[PDB]
């Protein structure tokens, strides 16, 4: 929203907020 | 080629980040 | 995201990501 | 009526948040 | 831990640690 | 009945969480 | 409170707690 | 800060910053 | 009566927190 | 749960979740 | 000369951190 | 020889992490 590095717990926090009621998958080794 | 080697190793935006939602 | 209730420290974390480099301004109804 | 009245007591989306950005 | 109520962003943070490298899958009852 | 029904409205432990992992 | 580096989301979390009802501004490029 | 209600993971995060290098001790009324 | 009784159910300030530090 | 570096606020968040009602001590210089 | 090049690039305390509050 | 020079400087697991609980 402007560039940042999203790693660890900060990445899944951003995923939660952004996708909302829809849901999301998380796979670190792909 | 997933989410880590894009948003953590590199940089990603909101529209590049929505692709992982259901 | 569809919607949701955002209160306290969850509100300022949402603002940090959504605003970014632009910056925000937090003023509660003291 | 403010940021706490509209997002905490009520509900707000992604485009309602952007208004409080600088 | 004995137990406790986990809702919102506290649920996805708990999943990130508990699952790890395996990964999780978050789907709320839309 | 799901993850929000069982952990948010009700209460869940460490071994109930592991079920939602990949 | 003792020295630490406060960056990203950890900086705005600290700002929230410390200023309280008063409020604060956040500008990263100043 | 004037005041506010601090419960759960928001309480231990507040203690981490306020105590620092001194350290804290968390014991709930089991 | 403790840390949860005084800060969670009731309200505490910055100088009430310092008491639980080592 | 798989390896990670737990530092700062992320360490005490993990401590809270893991020990639960029991409680824990935090001393950074030991 | 703001908040980033003080508390993130360098180090800042509680009394050095209160100056940014309203 | 404590918690920092194990889980932060080095790496620690869940069973290595429970030892600090009461
Ligand atoms: Cl970090
Ligand atoms: Na742009
Ligand atoms: Na000093
Ligand atoms: Na193993
Ligand atoms: Ni962090
Ligand atoms: Ni870089
Ligand atoms: Ni409601
Ligand atoms: Ni919360
Ligand atoms: Ni209940
Ligand atoms: Ni109250
Ligand atoms: Ni340094
Ligand atoms: Ni390493």
The answer to whether residues J1 and E15 touch, using CB atoms and an 8 Å cutoff, is no
**Among candidate residues L14, F10, D6, K20, the one with its CA nearest the CA of residue G6:** K20
CA distances from I17 to C7, E5, G12, H30 (A): 22, 24, 20, 20
Resolution in Å, one decimal, please.
Answer: 2.0
User: How many distinct structural domains can be found in chain J?
Assistant: 1
Dig out the tokens for F14 from the structure. 């460490």
The answer to whether residues B2 and A1 touch, using CB atoms and an 8 Å cutoff, is no
Helix (H) or strand (E) holding G27: none
Of C15, C25, C28, the CB nearest to D17: C15
Ligand nearest to the CA of G4: 11
PDB experimental method:
X-ray
Rounded-to-integer distance, Cα F10 and Cα E6, Å = 9
Helices (H) and strands (E) in chain G, counts: 1, 1
Q: What angle do CA J7, J11, A4 make, to 5 degrees?
A: 55
The answer to whether residues E12 and F22 touch, using CB atoms and an 8 Å cutoff, is no
The answer to whether residues H25 and I17 touch, using CB atoms and an 8 Å cutoff, is no
Structure-derived torsion over alpha carbons of residues H17, H19, H20, H22, reported in degrees to the nearest 10: -170
Q: Strand, helix or coil at F7? A: helix
The answer to whether residues E10 and F3 touch, using CB atoms and an 8 Å cutoff, is no
The answer to whether residues E1 and F14 touch, using CB atoms and an 8 Å cutoff, is yes
Mutate to test the interface with B, among A17, A18, A21 (most CBs of B within 10 A): A18
CA distances from C28 to A12, C23, D22, G16 (A): 28, 17, 16, 11
Domain that holds residue J10: 1-30
The answer to whether residues E15 and F21 touch, using CB atoms and an 8 Å cutoff, is yes
Query: E22 in contact with J at a CB cutoff of 8 Å?
Result: yes
């Amino acid at each position: 929203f402007v560039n940042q590095h999203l790693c660890g717990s900060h990445l899944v926090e951003a995923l939660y907020l952004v996708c909302g009621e829809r849901g999301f998958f998380y796979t670190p080794k792909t | 080629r997933g989410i880590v080697e894009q948003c953590c190793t590199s940089i990603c935006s909101l529209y590049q980040l929505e692709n992982y939602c259901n």
